[PDB]
């Protein structure tokens, strides 16, 4: 979690969401 699926950095603030919102958070906010 914390964007481990998509990123080398970590953003736990993306946790706790439904799937598309999680993915958006990770790829556009955590590690664009």
Author numbering: 1 to 32
Quote from the publication.
Lybatides are cysteine-rich and highly constrained peptides. Alignment of lybatides revealed that they contain eight highly conserved cysteine residues arranged in a unique spacing of C-C-C-C-CC-CC, with a sequence identity of 76.5% between the two. Disulfide mapping of lybatides revealed a novel disulfide connectivity of CysI‒CysVI, CysII‒CysVIII, CysIII‒CysVII and CysIV‒CysV. Comparison of its cysteine arrangements, disulfide connectivity and overall three-dimensional structure to other cysteine-rich peptides show that lybatides represent a new family of CRP with an unusual cystine-stabilized helical structure that has not been described in other plant CRPs.
There are three copies of the peptide molecule (named A, B and C) per asymmetric unit (ASU) of the crystal. Cys3, Cys7 and Cys11 are located in the N terminal loop, which is stabilized via disulfide bonds with Cys26, Cys31 and Cys30 of the π helix. Cys14 is situated at the C-terminus of the one-turn 310 helix and connects with Cys25 of the π helix (molecule A) and α helix (molecules B and C). This is very likely caused by conformational stress induced by the disulfide bonds at the C-terminus (Cys30 and Cys31). The majority of its interactions with peptide copies C and C* consist of water-mediated hydrogen bonds.
